[PDB]
Amino acid sequence: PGREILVLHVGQGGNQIGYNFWKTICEEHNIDIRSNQRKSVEEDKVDYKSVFLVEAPDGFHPRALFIDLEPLAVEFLVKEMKLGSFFSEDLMVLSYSGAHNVWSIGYQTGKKLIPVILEKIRDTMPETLQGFLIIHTLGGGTGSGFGSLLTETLKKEFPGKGVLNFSVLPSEVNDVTLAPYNTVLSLNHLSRFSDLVVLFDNTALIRIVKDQLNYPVIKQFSDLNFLIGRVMASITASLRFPGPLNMDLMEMAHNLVALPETKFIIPSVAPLTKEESEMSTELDLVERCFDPTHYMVNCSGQGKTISSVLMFRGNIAIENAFSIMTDIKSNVAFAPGVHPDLGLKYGICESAPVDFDKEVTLLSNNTIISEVFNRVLERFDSLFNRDWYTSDYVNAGTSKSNLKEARDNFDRIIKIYKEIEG
Numbered sequence: 220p221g222r223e224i225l226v227l228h229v230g231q232g233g234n235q236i237g238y239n240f241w242k243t244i245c246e247e248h249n250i251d252i253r254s255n256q257r258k259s260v261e262e263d264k265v266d267y268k269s270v271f272l273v274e275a276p277d278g279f280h281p282r283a284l285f286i287d288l289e290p291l292a293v294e295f296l297v298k299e300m301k302l303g304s305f306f307s308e309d310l311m312v313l314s315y316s317g318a319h320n321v322w323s324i325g326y327q328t329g330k331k332l333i334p335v336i337l338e339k340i341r342d343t344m345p346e347t348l349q350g351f352l353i354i355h356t357l358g359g360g361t362g363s364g365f366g367s368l369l370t371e372t373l374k375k376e377f378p379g380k381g382v383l384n385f386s387v388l389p390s391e392v393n394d395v396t397l398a399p400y401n402t403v404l405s406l407n408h409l410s411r412f413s414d415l416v417v418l419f420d421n422t423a424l425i426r427i428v429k430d431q432l433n434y435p436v437i438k439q440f441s442d443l444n445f446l447i448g449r450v451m452a453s454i455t456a457s458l459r460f461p462g463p464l465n466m467d468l469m470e471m472a473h474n475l476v477a478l479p480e481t482k483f484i485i486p487s488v489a490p491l492t493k494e495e496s497e498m499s500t501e502l503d504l505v506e507r508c509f510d511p512t513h514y515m516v517n518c519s520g521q522g523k524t525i526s527s528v529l530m531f532r533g534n535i536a537i538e539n540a541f542s543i544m545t546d547i548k549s550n551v552a553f554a555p556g557v558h559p560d561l562g563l564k565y566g567i568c569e570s571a572p573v574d575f576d577k578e579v580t581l582l583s584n585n586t587i588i589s590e591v592f593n594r595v596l597e598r599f600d601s602l603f604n605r606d607w608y609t610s611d612y613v614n615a616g617t618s619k620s621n622l623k624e625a626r627d628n629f630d631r632i633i634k635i636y637k638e639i640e641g
């Protein structure tokens with residue numbers, strides 16, 4: 220017993236992403252998400268289901284909480300996807316009134332539900348829990364504010380356990396005009412209390428789906444969020460299936476976080492289709508992961524990699540994984556202080572993702588984060604310098620001084636990344 224993880228889904232986006240994540244986890248473990256049972260004994264594989272799944276005498280359940288300040292996103296999701304016996308009511312923490320896209324309302328209002336959330340965690344979490352994953356968007360009010368509150372709360376209440384965030388940044392044109400405030404307040408909070416923040420944005424996700432999967436249309440967020448679920452599943456695969464070289468959450472964080480502030484990570488995965496997994500080399504897949512076309516954050520270029528984690532899944536030639544390392548270091552730009560022999564952390568798992576031959580997942584700590592964050596800062600300043608949209612932050616406990624304090628700390632993080640870039 221040990222290595223267990225609890226996943227908290229917060230707000231509309233965080234819970235919708237949760238559907239794709241848990242669908243992927245059940246499929247990888249050959250669990251029927253509708254019956255809660257193994258699909259069969261014969262195809263039960265040697266694995267460690269307890270990382271994300273609770274086995275009870277009646278069947279399997281997600282080690283998850285489904286948290287929102289309004290009920291519709293979760294209720295509609297559970298009905299449409301027929302999740303009623305897996306996303307069960309005892310795992311939901313729902314209110315009625317919404318955060319109205321204001322971080323401060325999400326933070327304040329969420330405080331009222333913290334006792335129930337802690338009781339549920341303390342009621343069912345094994346003592347050996349290794350950590351928490353918080354799934355949320357940063358541009359709305361509940362994912363951002365309540366997610367921030369939860370990051371702070373768990374790090375304070377459970378010292379010694381990992382707190383990792385999977386966080387969706389605003390799109391290149393924001394689809395919430397308040398998103399700069401909500402994103403700066405969230406990234407400030409996560410810089411204080413998270414151990415590692417894995418970032419995504421919808422501009423990059425849409426580009427990948429349209430250009431790598433060539434979907435003719437995206438009608439529901441499930442046809443975008445599957446990419447976030449894929450990253451979450453694959454970087455934990457070596458906790459759940461056999462393989463030559465396994466790694467846990469804080470093992471990956473320790474290899475990535477060069478300075479305490481540099482905890483903001485860009486993920487990528489290759490290939491995106493089964494057909495490509497059958498006609499690709501380890502070299503080709505790693506090169507795709509390091510290419511901006513595959514980054515799940517919208518970036519202007521390759522940037523400079525400070526540190527990276529690569530998970531090789533499936534039918535992997537270990538000699539190829541090792542021999543390409545000099546080629547990665549020669550062909551990918553790394554930050555000036557990175558020694559030629561350093562900057563790579565490998566995990567190798569024998570389990571391929573559903574029906575693929577092999578797959579590589581990259582977590583990159585990259586100086587280009589400074590460009591992504593600077594753009595957020597420029598959006599923030601365009602509102603804040605005019606005093607636009609501040610009233611309902613002020614009315615919910617975030618003074619104008621507090622907004623500025625969060626902005627200035629955010630800027631200090633940007634400058635650390637820019638300094639490392641050289």
Ligand SMILES: Nc1nc2c(ncn2[C@@H]2O[C@H](COP(=O)(O)OP(=O)(O)OP(=O)(O)O)[C@@H](O)[C@H]2O)c(=O)[nH]1
Pocket residue numbers: 229230231232233235236288317318319320321325356357358359360361362363387388389390394395421424440443444
């Ligand atoms: N990738 C992805 N983005 C989403 C999803 N749902 C919403 N978004 C994005 O998330 C941001 C809006 O945040 P929501 O998650 O809707 O807000 P919330 O956390 O429910 O907060 P409130 O509605 O303000 O209480 C926008 O940038 C949306 O485009 C989703 O399922 N997947």
Ligand SMILES: [Mg+2]
Pocket residue numbers: 230231289292359361
């Ligand atoms: Mg909402």
Ligand code: NA
Pocket residue numbers: 231320359
């Ligand atoms: Na909303």
